[PDB]
Design a protein around this ligand. Structure first.
Ligand SMILES: CC(=O)N[C@@H]1[C@@H](O)[C@H](O[C@@H]2O[C@H](CO)[C@@H](O[C@@H]3O[C@H](CO)[C@@H](O)[C@H](O)[C@H]3NC(C)=O)[C@H](O)[C@H]2NC(C)=O)[C@@H](CO)O[C@H]1O
Ligand SMILES: CC(=O)N[C@@H]1[C@@H](O)[C@H](O[C@@H]2O[C@H](CO)[C@@H](O[C@@H]3O[C@H](CO)[C@@H](O)[C@H](O)[C@H]3NC(C)=O)[C@H](O)[C@H]2NC(C)=O)[C@@H](CO)O[C@H]1O
Ligand SMILES: CC(=O)N[C@@H]1[C@@H](O)[C@H](O[C@@H]2O[C@H](CO)[C@@H](O[C@@H]3O[C@H](CO)[C@@H](O)[C@H](O)[C@H]3NC(C)=O)[C@H](O)[C@H]2NC(C)=O)[C@@H](CO)O[C@H]1O
Ligand SMILES: CC(=O)N[C@@H]1[C@@H](O)[C@H](O[C@@H]2O[C@H](CO)[C@@H](O[C@@H]3O[C@H](CO)[C@@H](O)[C@H](O)[C@H]3NC(C)=O)[C@H](O)[C@H]2NC(C)=O)[C@@H](CO)O[C@H]1O
Ligand SMILES: CC(=O)N[C@@H]1[C@@H](O)[C@H](O[C@@H]2O[C@H](CO)[C@@H](O[C@@H]3O[C@H](CO)[C@@H](O)[C@H](O)[C@H]3NC(C)=O)[C@H](O)[C@H]2NC(C)=O)[C@@H](CO)O[C@H]1O
Ligand SMILES: CC(=O)N[C@@H]1[C@@H](O)[C@H](O[C@@H]2O[C@H](CO)[C@@H](O[C@@H]3O[C@H](CO)[C@@H](O)[C@H](O)[C@H]3NC(C)=O)[C@H](O)[C@H]2NC(C)=O)[C@@H](CO)O[C@H]1O
Ligand SMILES: CC(=O)N[C@@H]1[C@@H](O)[C@H](O[C@@H]2O[C@H](CO)[C@@H](O[C@@H]3O[C@H](CO)[C@@H](O)[C@H](O)[C@H]3NC(C)=O)[C@H](O)[C@H]2NC(C)=O)[C@@H](CO)O[C@H]1O
Ligand SMILES: CC(=O)N[C@@H]1[C@@H](O)[C@H](O[C@@H]2O[C@H](CO)[C@@H](O[C@@H]3O[C@H](CO)[C@@H](O)[C@H](O)[C@H]3NC(C)=O)[C@H](O)[C@H]2NC(C)=O)[C@@H](CO)O[C@H]1O
Ligand SMILES: CC(=O)N[C@@H]1[C@@H](O)[C@H](O[C@@H]2O[C@H](CO)[C@@H](O[C@@H]3O[C@H](CO)[C@@H](O)[C@H](O)[C@H]3NC(C)=O)[C@H](O)[C@H]2NC(C)=O)[C@@H](CO)O[C@H]1O
Ligand SMILES: CC(=O)N[C@@H]1[C@@H](O)[C@H](O[C@@H]2O[C@H](CO)[C@@H](O[C@@H]3O[C@H](CO)[C@@H](O)[C@H](O)[C@H]3NC(C)=O)[C@H](O)[C@H]2NC(C)=O)[C@@H](CO)O[C@H]1O
Lengths: 146, 146, 146, 146, 146, 146, 146, 146, 146, 146
């Protein structure tokens, strides 16, 4: 069951405020006004939510997902999209996914890992820092469940 | 626009795990499994979410709401439901609302106050500690917006 | 806000007129002479007000309460006191309360349910038909509010 | 002894919802929240409670009163205030009273007549339909006694 | 260019003053205090502004719009919302729109027709008189332009 | 609360169409295209909106204002600007204001009087007919409130 | 006591398979997966279960009910919904009900008549063939009891 | 998804009406009154529902189950319980199950076979005709699904 | 005579893309669409145009100005606004101006210095880095003349 | 929106300084003194602005236009006017326009192409090098927009 939904405005997005690279659109989500982050083009693709471990219950397994959509204009996804949960000790749940040739214009949930706590910043995010242009990824929300 | 939804499982509820007083029900909320906290009866009514200030962006006004529903069986609401945001310094946004004779079986958003930052625990919650029995309040989510 | 107060004389009470089981006392209620129904002892405990739906406004949520007092001599309340609103179609808001170990000699409002109308008899009441003796309940009024 | 109190919200008041002519104010009446109907000015003065005969016990004489207050701003009462109980057969207990030069700011009970039953709508009310402006009548409650 | 903005208080709304069906909320509109008409529920949905033809210039084409918002609680809009301009000769610009499955929580301008004059009442409005319940339409203003 | 905004295009302005004396400029006003009337120079300064009394609700006090701006080039305002509401009976709410030495380049609302109805043309306007040149007054809108 | 429950998939529904007019939704009913028939809109409303008399015991009175729910979007029910049991000889138990202005979002059982046997098709159903659009009826099950 | 539930009263049970061998108990099943068939003891164990093929849709695969419970007093189940669907042509889907040493006091669904149609009696049932005593099987319902 | 006009979009503005501090508005400038940079509030006030020396003619004196407007809401200008032209060798034309108590709502041209060339980046700008809040400066254009 | 206006004095014009062929005239442009380049007659028609790529923002599409006017004395335009943007790599946006038989004495914007950057001279210009005499073209400004 879902503990937190966090919307991309609560995240840090490199070039997030620069309309050459990113855009925002107001939409309804089960009666709540949210803003989707809509990637036009960027090379330093980086989206991180920062939350404290004390926000979460200890001695219980959490899983985290990011809900996204590829547009008809999608390109540059022939590279590994790195998925990361950083715990307060400095350790990392590292995984990757390749978004190339997935169906456009449907929402899908990318799992970004699992964690358990036994106080301090937890980072949830995805990134690709390579010199190619990523285009046409829409971000809806980070979900944290237990 | 909505930055965080936090579901009652992420909160501390006095007698929350005791099926004499509280129950839980799995439902769908925009593709996501959540559990509604469904009050049968309690005298110490207390629900608190704990989040850290570093979860939030500075130099911007946040408002916080709690989405609830009264059942057909609702009673004991002829008392002030106290609403509280506690900031890290110990200071408090205190307000109250009276839920008696409201429409049952419709979701409504109780505003619990505003805050702005210029690091540390922020508490979002509602409570009534009086010796009467509160009955038939369903809790969906805490919403934090900016 | 309160639409109708109905005093126990306007109700049907099994054995109401039999001074072995029930008694009446004249008192003042806000400038108005009323008679409290004071249960000495009864096994068939049954109190019903009958009012017509056309007495009430449609497309609005009503709640109904019964104001009572337990005496120092109270006993037999370790049973479910059944609470009922019967609508004209035959359908029922069924709930219960247990009066055992409440404070004696203070007025309290028992909620007996909620209703909304979209013509015909509406019944408001409480009953316990078990073979034990209920003792020491004083009834002041049925309140109907919106 | 009092069988029913009915508050003006349960009644039909011509222009009742129109704040050019009528207003409402929340006050307490013996633990119960009621709304007083407070006439600012109206020419078609008409207040009617509708209750069914089956609400009442047969073979017993009922009397009905309306508790009102004139304000310091009272005027237009140099006309007959018509008092009426309409029985289900269509027949009417007609009387009148002149409110001019009465003490302001004290509650007084206007008797509006008597009835006995041996099923159907009973109307309790007062009216004046003349082209002058009635001002400064506050209505508390209809009382029905036996 | 805009000749008149007319706010819903200047209009006739069936059940407009009845808080079971309609509500009002004070908001700012470019320096000016206006009241939005916020439909909770009604079956006889009818909103008409009445203005005289002499208010308007002759031998010039006017267009008229009504600015509205659907809430997240919107329902009953799977029926034709009738749009009408009645000229003083009795003739009518009749059109309709279906509001079902539109984006909630965004203002949009419904065009209600065009007219040209070559003295007497002009009616601008929208209605649906069917026995279903319309819910969750907020009305900002009628605009008349030329 | 505001009932009608009327823009200067809906008014009669002596020499309004003559670009030696008056000019017009398209601007946005809360999403609505309006045209400001911008006085360059005129001696017969006269601006009148004509609306019918039946456009307005009876038994309620209306106030009317005209929102204007003086430019840096303002002059000839060392005379009384006459403010007038003409009612259908022929009677007039006459007031005046002196615009000399006010702050330029800020919008301010000139109150032009009050009226109540207990059918026919109502005129709202301002004028000065003296042989001097009035210069540099920009007109935004007539507001009618209740 | 209940002899058969028959779910709408076992019935014939005009336009049942056409998602412009009807939809289906999988839900749980006491451990059993059923599909509710959910009317969006249709003009030829017709739902018939066909069962043989030999399915049933002779010399005993059966009653049949259909359990339905009106949605918040309900409309077109200001017409008689015809209720019909056709026996093998061709004879019919004809009755009707009007669903307009009933509470939405609660299950209720429509009785569709009675039969007794002393071999061949029995039809249980409801229909309305008029040119208006029926909307927002959800069907759970036909119940046959004795 | 479930097409028909058929309760044991609709079936033929050898010695069903003889309280030495079988008993019945009224219980609630998702708001419907049903009677469980509760085997005390019998040697000729035989339960058959009879329905006509025309009750069912052709060219679609049906499966049938019987929901039962073994009591703490269960015995004699160390034999094959024969499961049978007889089609109208006379052909039979024959299978068996052994109920010995199953968990008592939990409902479980015995599959009794599959069928497809390309008019006439279909028999669904289970039997054991051996001379031993079967004891402590409770029958809830036959389910037919597609 | 004017050689180049450069509009604030062509410049770097600290917090320029952050709507907490800066905003943009589309306006017409002699038939050309430009965006005015409109300061709401900022502490690090910094605006720099970057152009290359090869953009300019050598052996001729250029002067540079910035056209701005203070709003009615202006504040924090009781500090020196630093004006700067940086030449490619690293040398700087430094001057300052105090904007406090200037006329609001009129465009004025701030001279930011002079330069002459005898290849490389030239920076034209104004800044104030002090910890107070600057508010209500609108920027139209940098002008370069010779 | 417009990023730069560049006036013909900032450009190189073959024979620009020779009053046999070209002339200059001081005029006002939105408060700014500019000089129009007014062609009397020339055979080598060539006008080039030189700006550096670092003057412009990367990863964004720019379009460039030249605003001109033909005089009543215009002639020699029965040839292709070549339009050119040269990028630093040496590559070219080549297009052409024919100015013969256009309206004289109105400003019009000739688009000269589009560019995007992913450091060095960018050339914007128009030319015709043929041996005929071009006459009566007035140049106002190069506009660069994004
Ligand atoms: C050269 C190549 O392979 N392709 C180019 C892209 O690399 C380039 O993207 C930009 O790359 C720079 C350099 O990595 C990014 O900035 C760096 O990354 C982070 C920003 O948070 C920071 O830690 C580094 O200091 C910073 N180094 C710099 C400024 O060089 C920059 O974010 C990328 N820009 C964008 C818009 O994504 C793109 C666009 O510049 O061009 C390709 O040709
Ligand atoms: C007697 C009466 O009228 N009311 C009874 C209620 O008081 C009682 O609810 C319990 O009340 C007690 C005292 O208010 C609660 O105790 C407190 O719990 C809080 C938070 O966990 C703790 O901080 C206090 O120190 C603690 N004080 C104690 C233990 O005395 C207790 O939580 C309430 N329990 C519930 C389930 O609401 C109920 C049931 O005990 O009966 C009423 O009749
Ligand atoms: C049996 C026992 O241990 N306790 C006795 C009580 O049962 C008994 O109360 C009386 O109970 C009967 C039946 O429960 C009540 O009679 C019923 O009355 C209602 C209408 O009032 C009618 O619908 C029923 O048919 C009728 N059933 C009968 C007569 O069998 C009766 O009201 C109860 N009386 C009182 C005063 O409550 C008490 C009192 O006699 O004695 C206990 O020992
Ligand atoms: C002119 C004068 O001396 N007095 C005016 C009043 O007559 C007038 O009061 C309004 O009078 C009309 C007519 O009596 C009322 O309309 C009546 O309303 C009733 C109830 O709904 C309805 O049954 C009648 O058919 C209807 N008569 C009609 C339609 O003519 C109206 O209710 C009165 N208004 C109020 C607010 O009481 C007032 C207001 O117009 O002005 C006096 O000057
Ligand atoms: C003479 C002086 O000092 N100032 C002159 C201004 O008076 C004059 O303005 C014009 O004045 C005339 C007379 O007041 C205006 O004409 C009047 O207009 C109204 C209708 O608008 C009409 O009912 C009157 O009959 C008419 N008066 C006449 C013609 O007798 C006229 O509108 C004014 N014009 C303007 C542009 O405001 C100006 C301009 O003529 O000149 C000054 O010298
Ligand atoms: C125009 C108007 O007022 N109402 C229209 C509706 O009538 C129409 O519903 C369709 O109506 C037709 C005619 O009644 C229905 O077809 C009929 O019904 C059965 C089919 O089971 C058949 O036995 C009849 O002969 C057949 N008559 C024909 C085909 O003419 C049809 O089922 C209705 N459609 C639906 C989806 O309910 C609707 C939609 O067509 O439009 C209204 O405007
Ligand atoms: C029965 C059904 O299908 N739905 C019910 C609705 O009919 C009903 O709303 C009320 O409906 C009537 C008629 O549509 C409306 O009465 C009319 O009011 C108008 C405007 O005042 C007037 O012109 C008509 O003369 C009058 N018709 C009558 C009285 O016969 C009435 O305004 C509606 N009320 C509301 C609140 O919208 C609603 C509520 O009763 O219930 C539905 O079930
Ligand atoms: C003797 C032994 O070992 N066991 C005894 C059981 O046989 C007996 O149960 C009864 O068995 C008979 C024969 O199996 C059953 O009669 C049969 O009933 C069917 C269906 O009606 C019918 O087709 C047969 O003709 C009939 N067979 C006959 C008459 O021979 C009978 O239904 C069984 N009864 C019960 C209650 O299950 C029991 C009880 O007599 O005793 C065992 O000792
Ligand atoms: C403390 C006080 O009275 N004033 C506060 C403002 O100073 C503060 O504005 C921010 O101030 C900081 C400190 O100078 C600025 O940070 C600097 O920004 C420049 C430009 O990017 C950067 O080069 C410096 O490294 C950086 N120093 C840091 C971060 O340590 C910052 O830009 C200012 N922000 C704004 C919006 O102007 C405001 C809120 O930011 O709070 C005042 O109370
Ligand atoms: C001869 C004819 O039919 N018409 C004559 C025009 O051709 C002539 O204009 C001059 O033309 C020459 C050649 O087109 C131009 O010279 C060129 O200038 C460019 C750059 O300015 C340079 O790259 C070339 O090297 C150079 N070519 C040479 C020198 O051969 C010259 O610019 C033109 N002059 C003008 C004023 O446009 C005119 C004027 O002499 O006379 C026509 O009759």
């Amino acid at each position: 069951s879902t503990h937190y939904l966090a919307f991309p405005r609560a995240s840090t997005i490199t070039w997030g405020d620069d309309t050459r690279y990113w855009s925002w659109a107001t939409v309804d989500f089960c009666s709540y006004a949210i803003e989707e982050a809509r990637l036009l083009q960027v090379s330093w693709l980086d989206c991180r939510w920062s939350m404290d471990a004390s926000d979460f219950k200890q001695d219980i397994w959490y899983n985290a997902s990011v809900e996204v959509m590829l547009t008809s204009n999608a390109s540059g996804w022939n590279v590994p999209l790195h998925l990361e949960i950083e715990l307060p000790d400095g350790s990392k749940q590292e995984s990757q996914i390749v978004l190339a040739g997935r169906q456009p214009n449907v929402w899908f949930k990318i799992p970004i890992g699992k964690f358990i706590l036994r106080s301090g910043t937890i980072r949830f995010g995805f990134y690709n820092h390579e010199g190619n242009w990523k285009r046409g990824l829409n971000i809806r929300t980070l979900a944290i469940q237990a």
